């Protein structure tokens, strides 16, 4: 049958580059014909021949009349829908796969597994389903928002790793990790270390023995949550990033935390789900990531880069490379995916760049994708192109 | 070739949790630009890698012209038509299997086989088609609209058995069982027992060698009458629910139909096509069911279910297992479908949620999708969200 | 590789009864959202998994701003299109194949040949494309109308047959059929007979070693051209069928011509294309055919089989075998084609039904199917449902 | 695996014919219900399976909002998309392949390359994938707009060259060649010659060891640069057609360049690309051109052929073979490609027919395609048929 797959070392190259922008909303005017599905939260998980693009639908498309209740995050509406990568996630085009205001999915070899939350906040439900089948749930352990990742999980070997949390948006979180085989859940790895908050983790293969997560804090630290997972034992232990680059918003300027690496700092309240990924070479990993360019607005959207270290004991600033999105344009989540070459894995960091005109009209999201490519160094930025009073 | 499917046990679990949304009239609003078909009678049907959901369209959409009509049930424009589940039955995503203002369909294994029923009142005729071809017929032997399901036909090693019926909606309709194997009829079951009016059977496997189904009697009883067919010997016999849950709508309170289990009682006339899907587990067996919350009127759907016992003589409730629709949103037909996981089979009910906006406006519904899902109890109900005005 | 397809015994049946309707233009109103293809000359050839719905379209949607000229037979715009049979033939379902105002295509059991006619009406051009590649072309013989069937062309062993015409439409348009393998014309045979005009054949196999075609004559007859072609020889003849139920559009009363077999008759200026197709037993022959129900116009449509006999000698009414179309419903062109069923072939007929308003609006068609199915007779008939006003 | 691809003889066959037209604003009417995208560059490319229709979109449909900046060549929304050739380019049907301004695809047997070009004027930068993979990228040598063909790569024994030009408009740019195998440039090839402006290069194969190429000087001669590249040592020449018959616009009365073959001659400044394919036999290689009727404007399009000598020093005119696109309608792009027939290869030139009617409104192409079929004359021209008012 299909082999399980595996993370591969990553094909050669030391810069990202502009990819593809899927911005549906080119196509959503009063005087068009198109039907962009209103959405949030989209993330990309790639097979081996294929890539998937997902997101949480509103269930309502642009031009429409469902608008209001669009800024709102969780509703009986939501749902998990995906389309091929570089198909325009329309009405029509889309698949709706469960009813989920919180979503995650990966393909293991062999199969999809997706994962959608939903229930009322006080005792949600992580449903997941594998192929056709639903195959198992998981219950609210802190009856506060139980949720998940809104990224791609990880599998190796058929072992599929994913992030829950539950708690107080401003207050206690303590995540979980969940080991999937086949839908269904084979282990639950309870984490260690610096734990009092951990959401919304950007999770990739360090190596076939070690997933990596950057998470937010929306509580205490701009700095994030780093997330080392041994896969063979399921043990993971958790201890903010120390580098001075701290990548969360709203943030303080750059090394402005004092003391030592797991100092909190200050405006650590609030927080957005950001963008890494891996560059496993044979010799040494490098780390991608993505933070706004604004320091307390989504707004732009740069990269940066980091060979090698202690992720939780360096203070090092993050090498600056590439201005994504500009200060002028959305930079709402970014998050980590892996494109299969026919030997080797190409890193990706997918944007959302979100048209937020408030309450009072539609709201939804176009992404963006830089991949690793070539040598020297980043060279276009990325515009949604949309108006939102067309 | 691929082999004959034959039920499994279900896979593990022991509540039912929300689980698909297909709601395509939340795209039908005049400013939008999307046409989702006007159907009603939907329902789902799996094969070993996809489910395919089927309805009846009125060949219009909305936004629209051709409402005129859709309130009705027969006419010469009614098709089966199915998306696979997931898609929204939208008029390109759908494909038109035949003429049909009655249905049925399923999955032997190896080849679909579809069922729709048109012709005058009196003189109806079940069509069959395996895969593309048109394959045999049946005639109307009481000359009284004869129809079917509207629910999934059900395979066991390449016999699909099929219950049709014919005669007065307030009278007598004694159903029959039709025997198909690749499309061609190689057996009529007449039924043996309480036999003056079954139509609408929801049908399924109880093991290898029982398929069970619970249907509506529209003229005597809000019992439903409850059909065990034996495979071995291809014979049936029907007696009615015995169970003080009344199923049907319209219905008396529960326990108010005294006497024996097969006393017709009260609020008889009138009825609704209900859901019922098997748990079969190695020494247990799981009925679970659903019915209007409204005891007259189609709205809201709640889940019941039974574990072992002889549905022709057990009084005792059904235990209530979670509300699917509030009181507050519509609840029409229901009806049962088992998704093929790798190992075992997960039962699922759907349930028609119509858009009843009275016969001066379109016409059609959504459907919700419940399967068993994990443990614990059933956490969320489905609301359409469709604004009938817009 | 796959096998090459030949002609089968037909499955067991002995009436047609009411298969599917395609009417695309349900979803044509000004208020809708749908974009059906105007076109006029349907048609449908199968191969063993599928069908294709072929038609010519003006390269023009409804609703749209092109309706002026869609009632004008050839121009620059017209091309051979095609969804699969059972999917509405829109903008965006469709496959354009080639320019053509003339076509046809079949499957050979191991790929589709399409055969598109376009040029200058004294000087045009028969082209063949074998899958994607264009392969070969064949050049007007008599300068006025180079044309062809207008439906299926027929393969057996991999050669594939094919009527094509040139010359008067008020005169002498001698026919030739074109033995084409592979996307290229190995044979062209040049037919014996009564020959002075033959068009727009229906052609389909007696058997594997005879096609035979009832035929158009548009100057001198309501009878139609019968063409038998000795598939191993390479050779045809054609005479008049002498059946006193003239099968043409206008016609004289049945059996009012008098004088033997061969006598032209009243009423013989004009035609329409007419539906025929085989039921091929192992001890006898059954032969379908379609005519309106008016004599002079273009209004209803009926089926009519006769077992047996020689078309060319017998004089004796075919059986009328139902109303597929009432005379208050269009039935314009007709056309025999064949469903592959897993052991025989299933004999079907397809009408196309115009929506005819005249030159100052849209001209386009429905598709109507019936095929042969179990035993009894005729029960429904097909209305296109359209509203032309919308 | 599946093998690499090597030019074949061509199909037997000795004139072109009309073939098919892509017109998709024949469906673009503010009152219609489709979403055509706003495209130019269009060219298509064939693998052993199916042709490709890839166009530069400007990530709008028509009707819509965002017509200005669609008469722009370069700015962050164009994209590189595709259909299957037949396929109506609308905003659902079309994927998305990357951000890109200037591009090129092909396939080599196994997979889809697919070249793309952005980034800033001074910096741009050649982006290659492969399948669904970013492989690689090429910088910028001369900081001037580095760009590519426009028309299909060509791949031998899984070796794909790509011709990259980089320079001024009105001044130097040297073309290089990229050689890609499996999506990574494995060398430059830096051309011999009459180097001094190449650029928009139509390449195919002249045999197993040469791909020849007919480009675009856009500064000093209506000539075309004639590039004979050898696949065996990696090397390539250019040098002027000698023609008379010079096929660029705009350019002066054939015949008028004065002196030897290399003289630029008269109406330099300017150009388009134009349709260049190969017809091989097995002693005589016939070369098939295409260029617009106008001398100046971008109107018309007529083919021209010559077969064998040496288009660096026949001075020849080349033979004229009919008119593809009359004066009345415009001619634009034209590129070569062929289509994979089961033993040989069939040529064929594509024309884009670009609707223009000025920065005020709207601009978008038509795609005609006309390749050899048959013998005879080409018989009939392509228009339109779209009213850009509508
Ligand atoms: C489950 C849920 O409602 N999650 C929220 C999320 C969360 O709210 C914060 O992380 C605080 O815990 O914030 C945001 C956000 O954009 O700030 C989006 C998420 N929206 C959705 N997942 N639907
Ligand atoms: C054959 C037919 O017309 N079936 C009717 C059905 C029927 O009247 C009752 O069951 C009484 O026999 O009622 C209903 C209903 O919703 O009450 C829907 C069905 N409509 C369709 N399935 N088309
Ligand atoms: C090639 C052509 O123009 N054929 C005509 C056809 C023909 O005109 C008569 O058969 C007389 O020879 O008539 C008709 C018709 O509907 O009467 C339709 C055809 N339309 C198209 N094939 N486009
Ligand atoms: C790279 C780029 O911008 N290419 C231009 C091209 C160019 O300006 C000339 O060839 C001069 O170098 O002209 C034209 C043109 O239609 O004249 C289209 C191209 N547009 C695009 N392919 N996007
Ligand atoms: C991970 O392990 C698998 C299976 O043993 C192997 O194919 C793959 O190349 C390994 N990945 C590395 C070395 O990063
Ligand atoms: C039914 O029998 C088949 C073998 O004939 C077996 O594969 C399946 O597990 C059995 N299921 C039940 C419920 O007995
Ligand atoms: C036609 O010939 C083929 C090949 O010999 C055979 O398979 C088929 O059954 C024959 N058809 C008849 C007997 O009608
Ligand atoms: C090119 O060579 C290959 C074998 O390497 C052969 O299949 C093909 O026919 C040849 N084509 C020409 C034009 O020489
Ligand atoms: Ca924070
Ligand atoms: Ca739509
Ligand atoms: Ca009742
Ligand atoms: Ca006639
Ligand atoms: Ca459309
Ligand atoms: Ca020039």
């Known amino acids: 049958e299909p082999e399980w797959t595996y993370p591969r070392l990553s094909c050669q190259g030391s810069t990202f580059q502009k990819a593809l922008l899927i911005s549906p909303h080119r196509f959503g005017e009063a005087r068009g014909n198109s039907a962009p599905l209103i959405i949030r939260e989209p993330f990309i998980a790639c097979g081996p021949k294929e890539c998937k693009h997902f997101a949480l639908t509103h269930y309502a498309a642009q031009p429409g009349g469902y608008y209001n209740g669009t800024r709102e995050d969780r509703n009986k509406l939501r749902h998990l829908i995906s389309v091929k990568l570089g198909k325009i996630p329309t009405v029509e085009n889309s698949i709706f796969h469960m009813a989920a205001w919180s979503g995650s999915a990966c393909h293991d070899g062999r199969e999809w597994t997706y994962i959608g939350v939903d229930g009322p ?90 997933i990596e997560c950057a998470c937010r804090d929306n509580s205490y630290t701009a700095k994030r949550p780093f997330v080392k997972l041994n896969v063979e034992t399921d043990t993971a232990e958790i201890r903010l990033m120390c580098t001075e680059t701290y990548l969360d918003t709203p943030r303080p300027d750059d090394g402005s935390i004092t003391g030592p690496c797991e100092s909190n700092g200050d405006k650590g309240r609030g927080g957005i789900k950001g963008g890494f990924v891996h560059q496993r070479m044979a010799s040494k990993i490098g780390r991608w990531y993505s933070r706004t360019m604004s320091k307390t607005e989504r707004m732009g959207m740069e990269l940066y880069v980091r060979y090698d270290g202690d992720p939780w004991t360096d203070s090092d600033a993050l090498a600056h490379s590439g201005v994504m999105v500009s200060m002028k344009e959305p930079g709402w989540y970014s998050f980590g995916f892996e494109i299969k070459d026919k030997k080797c894995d190409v890193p990706c960091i997918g944007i959302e760049m979100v048209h937020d005109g408030g309450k009072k009209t539609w709201h939804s999201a176009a992404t963006a994708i830089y991949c690793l490519m070539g040598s020297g160094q980043l060279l276009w930025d990325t515009v949604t192109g949309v108006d939102m009073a067309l």
């Open 121 to 210: 906040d006080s005792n949600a439900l992580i449903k997941i389903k594998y192929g056709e089948a639903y195959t198992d749930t998981y219950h609210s352990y802190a009856n506060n928002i139980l949720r998940t990742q809104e990224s791609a999980c990880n599998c190796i070997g058929g072992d599929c790793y994913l992030m829950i949390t539950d708690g107080s948006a401003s207050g206690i979180s303590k995540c979980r990790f969940l080991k999937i085989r086949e839908g269904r859940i084979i282990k639950e790895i309870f984490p260690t270390g610096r734990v009092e908050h951990t959401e919304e983790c950007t999770c990739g293969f360090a190596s076939n023995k070690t």
